[PDB]
Amino acid sequence: LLGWGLKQAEEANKTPDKPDKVWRIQAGKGFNEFPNKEYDLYKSLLSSKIDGGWDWGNAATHYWIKGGQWNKLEVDMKDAVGTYKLSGLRNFTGGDLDVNMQKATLRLGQFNGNSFTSYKDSADRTTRVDFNAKNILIDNFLEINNRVGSGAGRKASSTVLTLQASEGITSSKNAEISLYDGATLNLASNSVKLNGNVWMGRLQYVGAYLAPSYSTINTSKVTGEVNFNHLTVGDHNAAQAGIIASNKTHIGTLDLWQSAGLNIIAPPEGGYKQKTEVQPTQVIDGPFAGGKDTVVNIDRINTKADGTIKVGGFKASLTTNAAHLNIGKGGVNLSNQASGRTLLVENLTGNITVDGPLRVNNQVGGYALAGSSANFEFKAGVDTKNGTATFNNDISLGRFVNLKVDAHTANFKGIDTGNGGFNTLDFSGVTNKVNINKLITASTNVAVKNFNINELIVKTNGVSVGEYTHFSEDIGSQSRINTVRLETGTRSIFSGGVKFKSGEKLVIDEFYYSPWNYFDARNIKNVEITRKFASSTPENPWGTSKLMFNNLTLGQNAVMDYSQFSNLTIQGDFINNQGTINYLVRGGKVATLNVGNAAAMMFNNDIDSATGFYKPLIKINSAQDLIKNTEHVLLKAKIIGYGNVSTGTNGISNVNLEEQFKERLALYNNNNRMDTCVVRNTDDIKACGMAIGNQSMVNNPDNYKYLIGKAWKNIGISKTANGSKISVYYLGNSTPTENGGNTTNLPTNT
Numbered sequence: 001l002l003g004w005g006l007k008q009a010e011e012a013n014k015t016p017d018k019p020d021k022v023w024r025i026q027a028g029k030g031f032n033e034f035p036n037k038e039y040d041l042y043k044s045l046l047s048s049k050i051d052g053g054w055d056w057g058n059a060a061t062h063y064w065i066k067g068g069q070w071n072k073l074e075v076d077m078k079d080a081v082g083t084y085k086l087s088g089l090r091n092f093t094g095g096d097l098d099v100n101m102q103k104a105t106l107r108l109g110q111f112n113g114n115s116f117t118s119y120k121d122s123a124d125r126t127t128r129v130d131f132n133a134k135n136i137l138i139d140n141f142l143e144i145n146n147r148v149g150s151g152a153g154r155k156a157s158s159t160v161l162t163l164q165a166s167e168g169i170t171s172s173k174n175a176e177i178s179l180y181d182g183a184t185l186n187l188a189s190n191s192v193k194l195n196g197n198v199w200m201g202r203l204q205y206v207g208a209y210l211a212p213s214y215s216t217i218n219t220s221k222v223t224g225e226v227n228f229n230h231l232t233v234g235d236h237n238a239a240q241a242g243i244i245a246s247n248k249t250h251i252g253t254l255d256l257w258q259s260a261g262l263n264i265i266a267p268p269e270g271g272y273k274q275k276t277e278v279q280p281t282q283v284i285d286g287p288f289a290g291g292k293d294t295v296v297n298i299d300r301i302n303t304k305a306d307g308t309i310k311v312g313g314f315k316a317s318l319t320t321n322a323a324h325l326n327i328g329k330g331g332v333n334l335s336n337q338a339s340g341r342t343l344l345v346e347n348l349t350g351n352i353t354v355d356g357p358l359r360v361n362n363q364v365g366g367y368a369l370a371g372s373s374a375n376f377e378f379k380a381g382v383d384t385k386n387g388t389a390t391f392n393n394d395i396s397l398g399r400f401v402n403l404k405v406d407a408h409t410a411n412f413k414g415i416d417t418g419n420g421g422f423n424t425l426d427f428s429g430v431t432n433k434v435n436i437n438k439l440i441t442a443s444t445n446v447a448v449k450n451f452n453i454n455e456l457i458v459k460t461n462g463v464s465v466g467e468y469t470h471f472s473e474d475i476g477s478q479s480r481i482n483t484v485r486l487e488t489g490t491r492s493i494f495s496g497g498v499k500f501k502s503g504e505k506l507v508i509d510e511f512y513y514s515p516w517n518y519f520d521a522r523n524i525k526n527v528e529i530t531r532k533f534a535s536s537t538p539e540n541p542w543g544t545s546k547l548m549f550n551n552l553t554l555g556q557n558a559v560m561d562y563s564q565f566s567n568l569t570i571q572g573d574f575i576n577n578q579g580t581i582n583y584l585v586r587g588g589k590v591a592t593l594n595v596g597n598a599a600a601m602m603f604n605n606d607i608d609s610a611t612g613f614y615k616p617l618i619k620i621n622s623a624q625d626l627i628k629n630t631e632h633v634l635l636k637a638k639i640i641g642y643g644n645v646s647t648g649t650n651g652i653s654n655v656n657l658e659e660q661f662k663e664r665l666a667l668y669n670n671n672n673r674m675d676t677c678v679v680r681n682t683d684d685i686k687a688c689g690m691a692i693g694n695q696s697m698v699n700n701p702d703n704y705k706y707l708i709g710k711a712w713k714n715i716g717i718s719k720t721a722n723g724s725k726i727s728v729y730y731l732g733n734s735t736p737t738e739n740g741g742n743t744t745n746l747p748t749n750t
Contacts, residue, residue, distance in 0.1 A: 004240040004263055007214045009284045011158065011184065016128050019096055023049050023066065023073035031080035039084050041099070049073055050094070057153035063092045069119055072096035080104050084133075088112035091148050093119055098130035106133035106165075109140025109175060116183075117146050120155035127159040136169045136189070138196070141176040145183035151205050158182035165189035168224070171196040180204050184216035190224030199232045201239030201260065213239040220272060222246045229253070234260030236307070247294040247322070253330075254301045258314035258341060266290030266322040287321065289349040289384070294322035300330030300356075305341045313375065317344035324351055331356025331393070332376070334366075340373035352380040352389045352407075360401055367420055368400040380407035385431060394438075397423050405430065414438040418459040421467055427451075428473070442496065443467030452480035460489040460496030460517055468497045475503030475524065486514035486545075488536060494518040494546060512536045513566050515543020525572065527552040529579075533560040541565045554579045564591045571596040578604050581618050582668075583634070588625040590728060593635035600641040603664070605649035609750045613678040613711060614649075616666035620728075623669055632728035640723050650749045658721040663744070667717060667730070674733065675717055676744070679707035694735050704738050712736050712743040 027045065042050070050073075053062040065071045073096065081103055087110035095118065108114050118127045145159045159182060163169060169187060171177070171194045178199035179185060200215040213234075219226055227250050233241045234257030242263035243249070249264060256262065269291045303316060325347045332354065334343060345352065360366035360374050368374050381387015389407040397403065399420030406429020417423040418440035425441075427434055427448045434451035442461045446469070461467035489496050497518035505526035513519075513535035521527055527549060535541045538561055545565065551572030554560075558579040562568060563586055574595055583590060593599075606615040618634070626632070640658075648655045667675040672691035679688050682701035689697025692714070696703050706712070716732020736742065 001212055004214050004216075004242045004261065005287070006284075008184075008216050008218075008242055008244075010282060013280070013282060014126070015280070017070070017072070017096060017125055019070055019072035021066065021071040023071065025049060025073065025075050027075065027077040027080050031077065031082070033081070035081045037082045039082055041084055041086050042089055045075065055149050055153055058150035059091070059148065059153065061091045062148070063089065063094060065094050065096075069093050069095045069121075070123070070125065075099045075101075077104060078102045083107065085110040086114055088114075090115045091146070092116050093148065094127065094129075095125060096128050098128075099132065101131070101133045103134055105135045106131065106137065108136065108138045108142060109172065111140075113141040113143065115143045115146050116159055116161055117144070117148050118157045118159050119148070120157040124157060126157070128162070129160065130162045130164070132164050134165060135167050136163055136165045137171070138169070138175045138177065138194075139172040140174065141178065141196075144177075144179035144185060145204075146178075146180055147204055156180075156182070156204065159184070161185035163187050163189070164221070168192065169194070178202055179215050179217075181211055181213040181215075184218065186221070187217070187219045188221035190222060191227070192219060192222050192224070193227040193229075195229045197230050197232060198228060199235075200241035201233055201237070201257075202235045203237060209237050211237050213237055215239070215241045216244070217241075218244045219246055220244055220267070226250070231255065233257060233262050245296070247291055249295070249322075250297045250299070252300060254298060254318075256301070256303050256316040256318070256343070258303075258305050258307070258316060260316050262318035264296055264318060264320050264322065266294035266296070266320070287319075287348055287383075290321040290323050292323060294350070295324050295326065296320055296322040297326045297328060299328035300333075301327070301343070301345070302333040303335045303341070303343060305335035305337050307337065309337070309339050313340045313342040313373075315342040315344055317346060320347045320350060322347075322350050324353065327352070327354040327356055329356050332358050333362055334360040334374050334376070336361050336366075336368055336372050336374045338369070338372055340371065340375060342373075342375040342377070344377050344379075346377075346379040346382070347387060348379075348382050349384045349387070350381060351387050352378055354378075354389075354391050355393050357393060358395045358397070358403075360398065364396050365419060366396075366398040366401060368398060370400060372400060374401045376401065376403045378403075378405045378407065378410075379429075380405070380410070382406075397425075399423075402426070404428070407431070409433040409435075411435040412437060416440045417444050418442040418457070421461060441469040444469055446471050447473040448479075449474060450476045450478050452478075452482065454482040456481050456484045458484070458486050458496065458498055458517065458519075460487070463490050463493075463495060465493065465495045467495070468499060471498075471500045471503075473502060475500065475506060477505055479503065479505070480507045482509045484508060484510070484519070485512040486517045486519065486536060488514050488543075489516035492516065497546070500524060513541070513545040513547075513561075515541070515545060515565070518546035518548065520546065520548045521550065521552075522548075523550060525551045529554045529558045530556075531558050533558055535561055535566070553577070554581075562591055562593060564589070567594070569594060569596070570599075573597055574599045576601045578606050578615070580616055583618070583620040583623075585620070585623045585626060588623075588627045590620065590623070590626075590632035590634055592633035595635065595637050598639040598641065599635065599637050600639070600643075601661075602643045602645070603649070604645050605651075605747070605749065606664075607650070607747050607749050611678045612680045612709070612746050612748075612750065613676070614664045614747070616668070616673065617661070617664035619666040619668045621668045623667065626667075626669070626730050628733075629731045632730055634719075634728045635726045637723075637725050640721065640726065642721065650747050661721045662719045665719060667728075674714055675719075676711050676713050677736075678711045678746070679704075680709055680746070692733065692735065696735070704736075706738055706743055709746050709748060710743060711746060715742050 175196035238259040240261040380389035394414035402424040404426035421443035499520040685701040718729035
């Protein structure tokens with residue numbers, strides 16, 4: 001209930017005990033002349049001053065030192081050479097072993113495990129069990145602060161194991177290290193590689209599911225390569241483990257519990273270091289900052305999760321002070337019961353780099369039910385706010401799973417939420433940048449303040465409605481989406497789609513329509529389009545595409561495919577820059593463009609070598625069935641404020657602006673232009689005669705010589721450029737005269 005940061009700090013600085021009867025045992029001659037003799041410790045040496053017994057009250061074995069558990073002993077070999085074993089010291093109560101074994105290989109496992117526990121007296125004693133071997137090689141299971149008898153009898157107080165080898169502490173596969181409610185241990189060798197089931201926190205008794213049950217593996221002195229293999233924190237209780245490592249922690253499979261915590265704490269920057277009565281100074285530490293080269297390579301996070309149902313989840317958590325929290329190819333698992341199991345992958349003052357697939361219930365998709373809201377959560381650099389949470393692997397979310405990241409810069413590579421839906425994809429803590437590479441949504445609750453998703457896929461929701469892409473907060477000013485590609489929805493109903501809630505600008509480069517998926521763009525006032533603005537099926541469109549805007553702007557060279565199949569609706573000041581909007585008829589009728597407030601336009605001296613004239617400013621392609629002698633509404637307008645970069649293009653002139661607007665438009669038929677026909681030599685005579693359908697330009701190119709760097713307007717096509725309408729009066733495909741009129745020159749400024 002106090003927390004682990006108080007508990008490890010208050011047992012970091014204690015006086016050991018007050019033991020009377022300090023026994024001293026020295027191994028003399030005989031041990032120090034056989035380097036491979038394979039001795040024992042208990043029967044050969046330690047059973048002299050360690051007595052067995054029976055605890056009255058549900059015991060199996062019982063061991064203390066001499067005449068009670070309050071007597072220090074020691075073993076001082078310092079030259080004994082060989083190899084040894086403990087092999088069966090179970091339910092040791094004792095107190096203050098310190099087996100000093102220089103140049104002596106140890107082995108705490110042979111045919112039987114071990115145990116080290118204290119009793120809960122009125123003196124509140126520890127054990128402080130030390131070893132100072134050369135190698136250790138645990139090689140069988142070991143319990144620290146275990147259950148001495150069976151529930152009843154005497155209770156168990158705290159303890160300390162300390163293993164201070166000089167060459168390395170390996171372990172065997174069946175060596176389940178399992179320290180309990182009050183136990184700690186320290187290691188001091190180099191290159192500890194525990195290949196066994198490390199078990200921090202266990203049920204000390206049979207049914208006490210509400211114990212605090214702290215632990216500690218403080219491998220502070222390890223100068224080599226710490227390498228755990230298989231941890232397990234918590235067992236049917238709210239254990240709060242902690243590890244104070246030595247800035248390199250490669251572990252393997254991690255098996256947390258539901259309500260289990262973990263605190264991997266990297267070292268600091270320079271490394272570690274009738275009368276009044278005065279208690280000693282209790283120096284405490286808050287959550288500090290790890291050093292620069294602090295690496296914690298947790299390469300698999302599983303979770304055990306079963307049991308009852310509480311009103312919330314349980315929120316397993318690991319807290320890391322390291323400047324890196326790399327998570328490799330194993331990825332993150334999440335076992336999920338009927339309620340919502342949650343994990344917290346938190347980093348205080350570091351980074352997080354996950355390169356693995358986020359699973360749940362041990363599959364990649366991982367559907368969850370309504371009450372089981374599995375909640376992924378990542379915190380990269382909380383107390384420094386410069387920490388990045390880079391996910392260099394394509395994640396995959398099912399249904400009722402919720403990613404949230406509260407970092408400084410959350411880079412990504414791909415997000416899959418369109419398969420399951422109901423995914424709160426929160427980003428509310430992100431400072432400045434979100435680099436999502438690919439997004440797939442069905443019913444998502446995206447909340448980003450600033451991003452640039454360079455490619456966006458918005459899928460539908462099958463056939464049911466109420467499920468859609470939803471940006472639920474302000475999108476900001478530096479936001480951007482380089483590619484939006486909606487896919488074709490369901491039949492005759494806008495079931496899937498996008499909607500916004502706030503924002504002011506969203507610089508889009510490229511867009512695709514889709515039938516029956518709506519691109520609602522609420523409240524954003526500067527929706528820019530930079531390049532091609534077409535549909536997902538540009539060859540054979542159908543359906544409708546609700547582009548329910550409030551404002552939009554189109555820049556240079558952004559071609560459009562505007563038809564009756566896309567009701568582009570504007571409620572604001574549409575500004576068109578040098579962009580060639582193309583039209584199509586789909587049955588002879590020209591699809592008018594419905595401007596709500598204003599369609600202001602402004603252009604350039606956009607002359608090119610493709611024509612010799614300016615760019616075709618508005619084209620109408622595939623209008624072969626264009627209805628003659630009938631007003632074709634080209635675009636609806638309310639205020640046409642037309643201009644160019646100056647009064648006159650190609651420098652400056654005094655020409656009124658609206659008349660050369662009619663020059664740059666195009667009516668594209670027979671693979672050429674019918675509005676004008678820009679003819680520069682004798683070769684495009686043939687193409688112009690293909691356009692107008694006359695044999696006067698087919699057989700003889702010298703028939704018409706008004707066109708050496710010139711052009712001519714076809715009469716029968718009338719265009720309005722006033723302040724309220726842009727219309728087309730297609731009434732004649734007239735044969736042009738040679739020297740009678742309706743002819744222009746070229747600007748000749750390519």
